[PDB]
Amino acid sequence: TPHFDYIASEVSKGLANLSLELRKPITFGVITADTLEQAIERAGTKHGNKGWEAALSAIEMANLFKSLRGTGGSGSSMEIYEGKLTAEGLRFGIVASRFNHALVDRLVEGAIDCIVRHGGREEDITLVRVPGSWEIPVAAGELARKEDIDAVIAIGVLIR
Amino acid sequence: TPHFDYIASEVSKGLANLSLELRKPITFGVITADTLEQAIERAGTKHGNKGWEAALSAIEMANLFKSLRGTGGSGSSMEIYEGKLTAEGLRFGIVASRFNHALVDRLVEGAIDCIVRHGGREEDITLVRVPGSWEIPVAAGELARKEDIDAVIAIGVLIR
Amino acid sequence: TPHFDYIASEVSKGLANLSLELRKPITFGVITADTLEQAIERAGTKHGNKGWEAALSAIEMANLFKSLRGTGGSGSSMEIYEGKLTAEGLRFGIVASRFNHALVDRLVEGAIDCIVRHGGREEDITLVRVPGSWEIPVAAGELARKEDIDAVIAIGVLIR
Amino acid sequence: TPHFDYIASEVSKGLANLSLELRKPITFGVITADTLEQAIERAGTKHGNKGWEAALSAIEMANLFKSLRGTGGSGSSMEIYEGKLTAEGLRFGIVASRFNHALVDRLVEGAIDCIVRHGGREEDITLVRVPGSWEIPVAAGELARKEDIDAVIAIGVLIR
Amino acid sequence: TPHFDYIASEVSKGLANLSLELRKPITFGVITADTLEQAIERAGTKHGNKGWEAALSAIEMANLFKSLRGTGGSGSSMEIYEGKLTAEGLRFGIVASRFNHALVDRLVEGAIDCIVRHGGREEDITLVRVPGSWEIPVAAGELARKEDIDAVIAIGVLIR
Amino acid sequence: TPHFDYIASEVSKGLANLSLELRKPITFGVITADTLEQAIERAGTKHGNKGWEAALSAIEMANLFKSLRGTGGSGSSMEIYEGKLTAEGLRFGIVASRFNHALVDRLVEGAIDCIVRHGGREEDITLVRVPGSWEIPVAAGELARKEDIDAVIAIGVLIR
Amino acid sequence: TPHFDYIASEVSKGLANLSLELRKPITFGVITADTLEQAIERAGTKHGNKGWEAALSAIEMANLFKSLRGTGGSGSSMEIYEGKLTAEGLRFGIVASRFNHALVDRLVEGAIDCIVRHGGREEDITLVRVPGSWEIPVAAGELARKEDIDAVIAIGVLIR
Amino acid sequence: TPHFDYIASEVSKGLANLSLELRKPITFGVITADTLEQAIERAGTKHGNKGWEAALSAIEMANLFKSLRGTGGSGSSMEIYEGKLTAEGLRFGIVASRFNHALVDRLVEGAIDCIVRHGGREEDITLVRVPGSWEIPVAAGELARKEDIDAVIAIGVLIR
Amino acid sequence: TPHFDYIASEVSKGLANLSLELRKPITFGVITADTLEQAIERAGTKHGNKGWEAALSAIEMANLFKSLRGTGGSGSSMEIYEGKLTAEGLRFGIVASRFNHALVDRLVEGAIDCIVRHGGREEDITLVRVPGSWEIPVAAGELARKEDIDAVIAIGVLIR
Amino acid sequence: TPHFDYIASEVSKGLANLSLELRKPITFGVITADTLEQAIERAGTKHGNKGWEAALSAIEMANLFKSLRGTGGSGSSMEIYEGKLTAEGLRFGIVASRFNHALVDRLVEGAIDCIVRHGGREEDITLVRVPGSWEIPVAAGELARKEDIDAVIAIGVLIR
Amino acid sequence: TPHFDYIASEVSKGLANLSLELRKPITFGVITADTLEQAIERAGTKHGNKGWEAALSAIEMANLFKSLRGTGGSGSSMEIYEGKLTAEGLRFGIVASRFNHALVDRLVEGAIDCIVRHGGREEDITLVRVPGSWEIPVAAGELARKEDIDAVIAIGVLIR
Amino acid sequence: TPHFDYIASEVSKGLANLSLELRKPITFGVITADTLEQAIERAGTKHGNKGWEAALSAIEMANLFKSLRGTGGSGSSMEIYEGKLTAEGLRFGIVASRFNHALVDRLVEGAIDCIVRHGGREEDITLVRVPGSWEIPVAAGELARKEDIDAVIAIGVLIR
């Protein structure tokens, strides 16, 4: 049914505009699959875990923004900016939906595992749960406005 | 005819932007079906009632936002935010269209039934009717700006 | 040709955003047909007149907004807001395109007929003509900003 | 390739939003064809010249806006606003792309021919050239902000 | 999978809006291919290098904007504005993604080669790397706000 | 039936010879279609209005003949003669048939609209109606012989 | 559509009768093609330029008529009359239509090139432009009646 | 017909031998297409302009030869020779054929545009025209022997 | 049989090298057809006369070379060299083969006709006949070395 | 096998260049057939003898060159040079290969028969035999450099 | 397209003649493939690296020529000349094109790797870059004429 | 692949030109086969040995050239020149490639066997080895210039 298309378009558009308005990194960890088999593939099976990948992107972006707003350094040569993959000292927020929870809970486990084994603390993670993917952008807007949050990770599953 | 696509795109886009601008929950209770049979399925028959589901999402989001803006509590561990399913003390607004009223009136009945049996009062419900789905976003904007409204529910039916 | 899609997307999007920004009703009276036969059907023939329907929606919305911004009344029960279908005292603006004028002039006749027989005056109607559908949103923006206009009706014909 | 779709969507969307923000007429003179033969048809051959048509729309819109912001006149009857097709005293800007220049230069010739034979002067035309269609909206934004420009004409060719 | 469409739509839309808001040139150097073979074709092989083309567009736009904001000159004739292809004295920023790095690094080489052989210095190039195409718009927003950057080049590869 | 061919041949031949004998411009505004759908296309719909086009040709020819019979001017270079598109001061005659009046009246409206918006007066238009296309040439001969008529426009519809 | 046949028949017939009545050479430089590809072939491509050929015929005919009306000479043998291909001292008029101008302007360039490189002057060429092929015969009649014109060249493009 | 093969073989062979004998750069800007559509593609349309590309090659080769015959410099490392893309101070000759002039004139425009916008002067360009591609090599031999010419550009169109 | 290919390759190659060695124009007037019908087409019938075309090329090249070796003139602008089509004062040589003489004699007639009617004298034409196409290059070498010959025309017919 | 092509190309090319370098006639009497039957046809059977034809060409060319280098004569009219078919006083050389000698010896007989019956002497014929067609050009070079040889005849047979 | 054939023929022919004229080794390291897949196969993948092979041939030829021009030695037996594969003391030049640089840079790496690991120095390698394969022969001619160069390596990629 | 054609064309062309320039016999002993089976057939199997055949041709040519440059003798009759098949006193050079050495070494054995059994000495044979067929012509040029070499034999194998 066409119900799939309109929800997917608005969730992706909402998160993108929000990141530019607040000038803070927000990572897209939402699965958009045509079949149930395709979704299981990406939820901790032969095609990996999308929750793990989204967390890794957030860590890099947080370090990159710390570098851009610093001194930068270097001189007499091309300046190159890049982000490390160390999570020590960073604080993260996660927004997850409850629909298709059999798959979503696998993605949330991956995101937490990535942060901890790269040097982060569970005490620095804030987790917010919403009833559906439609409510992710408005909930993400509340976390992104907090001063002590470095990046936000959005997780959900949509099946056509 | 392509008339279906343009109306559906603008209604979904309008409600999404409105929720982010006013920072208030708005739930998507609009059916978008390809055939008449598919619409009857979701209007109180073998595939459930979409009006009931939209009301349940609104109740949860209202409680969640009450929790985020409070003290929060907890410490020395991962903070988790979630919303209960009790409607005592909450105030709701509903916007419904008149086209395909044979189906829409079934969705409005479900939304009211959900609120009352979860502990709400009919005195706390405000209902606004508009001639069509195109007029839902502008009407929803008037309710969302009232200080004594906690969440808004949008209901409509579109058939290709 | 794909020329049809881009014009249709921008006209619908422009009018929708304009209504939310100015918080005034704007009705969508634009035909979007795949064949010439489908267009004649909706221009005063076996499938009705879209110009008549758009005017009827404008009258209802104007009365509804008068009711929301008033006292409202009622008490100890569910508040219900709805609009009458009387046009006495209301002032309307119309924006119409010149392309496919053989069909557009039938839609403009229907809109004027609806307003007059529901109790309106021709003296209270302002009509603006533009060369094409692409120019409708910018022209509609000038009328919507006038203080003595209650609603705007947009009329046009697009054929793939 | 899908490269065609994304460029076409952004160019049309950019020009539409720009016209509403600055409240000035901007005309869409961009060809969007599926085949090379379809493009030659509309570049000064059996299906006319799109550059000529875009210039004619600009002249009408400029006169219409002069009329709306004037006294208006009339009374005791329905007010009708329309634009003449005389270009005496008007000042125009043109933005043209360089890709597919074998066709684009035919469209620019048509636009200049239309303005001159309707009573305009070549001294009142400002022409800006950009490397591609993607750069049209940003260049059009510089011309539209000048106080002595009445309307802007955008010209380009895209082939799937 | 539909994952390709939503990412491509948001990246193109984000860059377009950013250029209009900041009124600075931003060039679209992102490949959007249906097959791996189509991508290799445009990454330094029989169909050229898209990184080279994007850099050439940036140089022209930078010179054009220098000309518009200057005196302009000329008189008693049609004013024509155009940009040279000399890069002496200009300063450029580049944002590149890490996904499909086997192809992306070919595009970055082309962009640097174009700038140097047209008269630019490597000391005037700032390069920022991001984990994926989704993060390009937010990173591009940081460079575009610097006062000593004349234009920004965005590079990435997406394969359906 | 072959009835279509003989009428069409004689009407076109009659008007052509008449223009050469009297040395005055006469424009061919007669539709010759194979199907009813083809005729509606050219009578104010997706393929334009033939009545508008015929009037535009008459205006140009009238100005051109005023220029040829004047001084001409210029020297030491190639002489070029062309006609403007201003209708101020010109006087026009129109001959229209009554068969297929549902379509013919759309063409007559277009011709009058073109003349007025290019600067002409309705007081300077003479309209003659004949029962059929066969009678157009003899009626056109009476108007063309008047001293105060600058050009004649012939309008009709023939369907095989 | 049969519209092509009637216009083509009248234009060819008009020019032929005009040449016999005034006893002056008139050359037929009008393309009559069934497809767009056939027209491009004869407008300066693999099948030559019809504008060049028409000018060459005019030069020969002008010299031939100068020879017939002279002494003739010769005796006691068969008299043979023929025309040279030198354009020194001759004066030419050209009538060209504006429809399908993308092709017509190529034919006019060829005609001027032929005259100049055979020894003629641009100062001796008079160029008249008309809105369409239907108006060519009446315009050609004005030039042919001038005493200082030796031959007339008619140029146009018609596509079925 | 086999006429295409023999002309193409001799033109390419002639230019190649000439460049080696005189030890001066000569660039191959001749289109060799199987169909008319393929030729239009490369004459300023979706596949670019071959005249522009040939001029760019000439500029690079001229700078490279200036570098080889100079000091060279560098030491204790691999010597690398390359040419810049600045045209300041260079002098160019162009040889163009007249057959298929509708396409050839587009290629000549591109070559001149490239030279001027890279810093060259029109005063430093010498243009020679020949009746056909067969005559290009002998004409190119006269320009290449002049002492004040740095490179030669050959332009033509051949269609099988 | 393959006999056709080897003769055609050597005749074309021989004439091309000869023109470069002696630096004198030589024109290729040899028909290379696959069928007898194709040859008759080009020997004075619906596809013209190749002997006429070859003579016209020789006249232009002779005038061009007279211009290059002269003063040239012009200044402060782009120098353009081109050849007139006047044959007064020029001297020509012709080499023709005897095989397929039924067709060759038609080509020789055309070449002589072209020269005389453009202003040349028959007294200035030298005609040499050889038994076959294989012997054309060696015979052409004797004429090209004479000081009082301006250009050479080669004529022959080969059929596969 | 492709062995046939390379030998045939080099033998024909070698003889052609040799004739131009030494400025002496050399005739091509080599059969190039696809099948054995085709070769027997041309070796003294229903399609004639190629050895006879090559000798006849040599006789004509020898007389022609005697005429060109003489006085020439004639005046006040077109000069025509041609060769007789008398062999009295001429001296000839023949180079023949040994491969396929069953056919080659028939060709050598024909060449000698032609010379004798046209008035030549066997005492004036020099015959050189080589092992194969590849060795013909080098052997022909030794004969052509002798002062008392007027023309050379090359004979061989190649079968694919 | 046939463009591939003519470029390939001239590049191979140019290098071959150059080696014989200067009597110095030149190696053919140019890939000529029908498909992109075939080219990747030979650019450092399952079918090896053509750049490595060309360098190995150059080393052997350089040693062989050193041996031929020396004493030679040996006696009373068959003399055999052969080249070692040691690169100590030799000096090499490389000419490489820029088109299809994604593949060409792999070939240049292989050539340098071969020379160094066989005992050569990077200080003894001269590298020249040209815009395309057409320019390789003229650039190779400049290196081959230097006294301190032992062999030249030509590298390029052409794809049909 | 087309790689086969270009190498084969240049090797055959190089050897042919070399023989004419130095006026010394050079024999073509290179196999050009389409399949591996065809090559084994000609390398000492059912279709003979090409190395043996090439040596036999060299012996004959060496004796023939000794006869031409001698007295010649004979008189009062047709002079006939031919070569014996005795190798006593003659000196030979051989150039062989290393690619496909499994087959090439069979051809070299045949060439040596032919010379010895016809009366030659192994002491009079000089053998030069090159890495590939491309290097044969340049190596053959060094041997052919030695005064004490009577003929050269070229051996190689190419497989499509």
Is H13 close to K14, i.e. CB distance below 8 A? no
Chain breaks in chain L (C to N over 2.5 A) after: none
Positions of E strands within L13-90: 26-33, 43-45, 48-49, 79-81
What pairing do the DSSP bridges indicate for beta strands F43-45 and A151-159? unpaired
Residue E34 CA: distances (Å) to CA of B16, E154, E158, E159: 31, 20, 9, 6
Token pair belonging to G101: 């101008």
What pairing do the DSSP bridges indicate for beta strands F48-49 and E92-97? unpaired
N-to-C CA span, chain B: 7
Residue matched to tokens 């060719």 = D157
Contact predicate B32/A2, CB 8 Å: yes
Is G100 close to D49, i.e. CB distance below 8 A? no
Q: Please count the other Cβ atoms lying within 10 Å of the Cβ belonging to residue A1.
A: 12
Any residues with CB less than 8 A from the CB of J64 and at least 6 apart, and which? I128, I129, I130, I139, J81, J82, J83
Supply the DSSP string of E24-53, one letter for each residue: --EEEEEEEESSHHHHHHTEEETTEEHHHH
Measured between CB atoms, which of H85, H117, H119 is closest to E117?
A: H85
Contact predicate J140/J79, CB 8 Å: no
Query: How far is it, in rounded angstroms, from Cα K100 to Cα E42?
Result: 10
φ/ψ (deg, to 5) at K23: 55, 45
Q: CB-based contact (8 Å) between B142 and chain C?
A: yes
φ/ψ (deg, to 5) at B154: -110, 130
Query: How far is it, in rounded angstroms, from Cα L88 to Cα J47?
Result: 45
Contact predicate E18/E137, CB 8 Å: yes
Tally I–J CB contacts below 8 A.
Answer: 81
Token pair belonging to F102: 């549902």
Q: CB-based contact (8 Å) between H101 and chain G?
A: yes
Query: How far is it, in rounded angstroms, from Cα H56 to Cα H77?
Result: 30
What pairing do the DSSP bridges indicate for beta strands C151-159 and C92-97? parallel
Q: In terms of C-beta density within 10 A (0-12 exposed, 13-18 middle, 19 or more buried), how is residue F40 classed?
A: buried
- The resolution in angstroms reads 2.1
Tally H–I CB contacts below 8 A.
Answer: 80
Query: With the CA atoms of L96, L98, L102 and L104 taken in that order, what torsion angle do they form, in degrees rounded to the nearest 10?
Result: -10
Query: How far is it, in rounded angstroms, from Cα F15 to Cα F140?
Result: 8
Chain E residue whose CA is closest to K35: E46
Token pair belonging to C24: 């005034």
What pairing do the DSSP bridges indicate for beta strands B43-45 and B48-49? antiparallel
Q: Please count the other Cβ atoms lying within 10 Å of the Cβ belonging to residue E149.
A: 18
Element (H, E) at E92: strand E92-97
Any residues with CB less than 8 A from the CB of L54 and at least 6 apart, and which? L27, L28, L29, L111, L153, L154, L155
F41 contacts in chain C (CB < 8 Å) = 36
G37 contacts in chain H (CB < 8 Å) = 36
Of G4, G58, G6, nearest in space to G29 by CA: G58
Query: How far is it, in rounded angstroms, from Cα C159 to Cα C40?
Result: 11
Chains contacting I (3 or more CB pairs within 8 Å): G, H, J
Residue matched to tokens 């060695």 = I21
Q: CB-based contact (8 Å) between J33 and chain I?
A: yes
Chains contacting F (3 or more CB pairs within 8 Å): C, D, G
Contact predicate B87/B119, CB 8 Å: yes
Contact predicate A54/A153, CB 8 Å: yes
Q: CB-based contact (8 Å) between G148 and chain H?
A: no
What's at A160, amino acid-wise?
R
DSSP state of C17: H
Query: How far is it, in rounded angstroms, from Cα B109 to Cα B52?
Result: 8
Any residues with CB less than 8 A from the CB of F78 and at least 6 apart, and which? G122, G123, G125, G126, G127
DSSP state of F75: -
Residue L136 CA: distances (Å) to CA of K19, K25, K80, L36: 11, 11, 15, 22
Residue D122 CA: distances (Å) to CA of A127, D88, D117: 65, 11, 11
Q: Please count the other Cβ atoms lying within 10 Å of the Cβ belonging to residue K120.
A: 21
Query: How far is it, in rounded angstroms, from Cα F136 to Cα J26?
Result: 80
Query: How far is it, in rounded angstroms, from Cα J41 to Cα J61?
Result: 26
Q: Per the annotation, does B86 bind a ligand?
A: no
Rg (C-alpha) for chain C, rounded Å, is 16
Q: Per the annotation, does D100 bind a ligand?
A: yes
Contact predicate K123/H78, CB 8 Å: yes
Sheet strands side by side (includes F79-81): F79-81, G125-130, G92-97, G151-159, G26-33
Query: How far is it, in rounded angstroms, from Cα A140 to Cα A138?
Result: 5
**Least Cα separation, residue G15 to chain F (angstroms):** 10
Query: How far is it, in rounded angstroms, from Cα C154 to Cα C132?
Result: 12
Query: How far is it, in rounded angstroms, from Cα G13 to Cα K98?
Result: 61
Q: Please count the other Cβ atoms lying within 10 Å of the Cβ belonging to residue K77.
A: 9
Cα G159 to chain centroid distance, Å, stands at 19
Q: E127: helix, coil or strand?
A: strand
Of F158, F160, F136, nearest in space to F31 by CA: F158
Chain breaks in chain H (C to N over 2.5 A) after: none
Is D56 close to C131, i.e. CB distance below 8 A? yes
Measured between CB atoms, which of C36, C101, C102 is closest to F37?
A: C36
Of E146, E110, E103, nearest in space to E126 by CA: E146
Is H102 close to G41, i.e. CB distance below 8 A? no
Query: How far is it, in rounded angstroms, from Cα I129 to Cα J57?
Result: 12
Query: How far is it, in rounded angstroms, from Cα K92 to Cα K84?
Result: 16
Contact predicate C26/C149, CB 8 Å: no
Token pair belonging to K143: 């290196």
* Residues in a beta bridge with L155: L29, L96
D46 contacts in chain G (CB < 8 Å) = 36, 100, 159
Element (H, E) at D64: helix D50-68
Chain G residue whose CA is closest to I118: G85
Active-site amino acid positions of G:
3
Of F128, F67, F64, F134, nearest in space to F92 by CA: F128
How many Cα atoms occupy the beta-carbon half-sphere of D116 within 13 Å? Answer: 12
E119 contacts in chain H (CB < 8 Å) = 84, 86
Query: With the CA atoms of B10, B12, B14 and B20 taken in that order, what torsion angle do they form, in degrees rounded to the nearest 10?
Result: -150
Token pair belonging to H136: 């290009």
Q: Which residues of A are part of a known binding site?
A: 1, 28, 42, 50, 99-100, 133-135, 157-159
Q: Per the annotation, does G65 bind a ligand?
A: no
Supply the DSSP string of A15-47, one letter for each residue: HHHHHHHHT--EEEEEEEESSHHHHHHTEEETT
Query: How far is it, in rounded angstroms, from Cα H5 to Cα E50?
Result: 35
Q: CB-based contact (8 Å) between D26 and chain H?
A: no
Query: How far is it, in rounded angstroms, from Cα C84 to Cα C90?
Result: 12
Query: How far is it, in rounded angstroms, from Cα K121 to Cα K118?
Result: 9
Q: Please count the other Cβ atoms lying within 10 Å of the Cβ belonging to residue F59.
A: 26
Measured between CB atoms, which of H82, H85, H117 is closest to E84?
A: H117
Any residues with CB less than 8 A from the CB of J133 and at least 6 apart, and which? J7, J11, J30, J97, J99, J156, J157, J158
Q: Please count the other Cβ atoms lying within 10 Å of the Cβ belonging to residue K47.
A: 11
Contact predicate F122/F109, CB 8 Å: no
Angle, helices K136-144 vs H3-22, to 10°: value is 30
Chain C residue whose CA is closest to F103: C102
What pairing do the DSSP bridges indicate for beta strands D151-159 and D26-33? parallel
Q: C59: helix, coil or strand?
A: helix
Of C57, C160, C39, C26, nearest in space to C101 by CA: C39
Element (H, E) at C49: strand C48-49
What pairing do the DSSP bridges indicate for beta strands C43-45 and C48-49? antiparallel
Residue H130 CA: distances (Å) to CA of G113, H136, H150, I74, I81: 14, 7, 21, 20, 9
Element (H, E) at G36: helix G36-41
Query: How far is it, in rounded angstroms, from Cα C21 to Cα C17?
Result: 6
Supply the DSSP string of chain E, one letter for each residue: -THHHHHHHHHHHHHHHHHHHHT--EEEEEEEESSHHHHHHTEEETTEEHHHHHHHHHHHHHHHHHHHTS-----SS-EEE------TT--EEEEEE-TTHHHHHHHHHHHHHHHHHTT--GGGEEEEEESSGGGHHHHHHHHHT-TT--EEEEEEEEE-
Angle, helices K136-144 vs H50-68, to 10°: value is 10
Q: Please count the other Cβ atoms lying within 10 Å of the Cβ belonging to residue B118.
A: 16
Residue matched to tokens 């009637």 = G6
Element (H, E) at K97: strand K92-97
- Tell me the Ramachandran region of residue L16: left when phi exceeds 0, alpha when psi lies from -120 to 50, beta otherwise: alpha
Token pair belonging to J80: 């025509």
Token pair belonging to E88: 């002496």
Is I123 close to J76, i.e. CB distance below 8 A? yes
Of G149, G156, G155, G157, nearest in space to G25 by CA: G149
Supply the DSSP string of H83-112, one letter for each residue: -----TT--EEEEEE-TTHHHHHHHHHHHH
Of A51, A60, A61, A37, nearest in space to A95 by CA: A51
Token pair belonging to A138: 């408005």
Residue B11 CA: distances (Å) to CA of C9, C138, L63: 13, 21, 100
Q: CB-based contact (8 Å) between C86 and chain D?
A: no
Token pair belonging to K91: 């000096």
Query: How far is it, in rounded angstroms, from Cα F52 to Cα F62?
Result: 16
Is H28 close to K134, i.e. CB distance below 8 A? yes
Residue D124 CA: distances (Å) to CA of A68, D104, D151, J31: 46, 21, 12, 76
Query: How far is it, in rounded angstroms, from Cα J114 to Cα J54?
Result: 10
Is K19 close to L138, i.e. CB distance below 8 A? yes
What pairing do the DSSP bridges indicate for beta strands L79-81 and J125-130? parallel
Element (H, E) at C67: helix C50-68
Query: How far is it, in rounded angstroms, from Cα K86 to Cα D74?
Result: 101
Any residues with CB less than 8 A from the CB of A126 and at least 6 apart, and which? A91, A92, A93, A94, A143, A149, B78, B79, B81
Token pair belonging to F99: 């068969």
Is H44 close to D159, i.e. CB distance below 8 A? no
Which candidate in F6, F10, F12 is best for mutational testing of the G interface (most G CBs within 10 A)?
A: F12
Residue matched to tokens 């191979």 = K12
Q: Per the annotation, does L134 bind a ligand?
A: yes
Element (H, E) at H130: strand H125-130
Return the biggest CA–CA distance within chain G. 58
Contact predicate J64/J82, CB 8 Å: yes
Query: How far is it, in rounded angstroms, from Cα C56 to Cα I159?
Result: 81
Q: CB-based contact (8 Å) between E16 and chain A?
A: no
Contact predicate I69/I128, CB 8 Å: no
Token pair belonging to F10: 């004689």
Chain breaks in chain F (C to N over 2.5 A) after: none
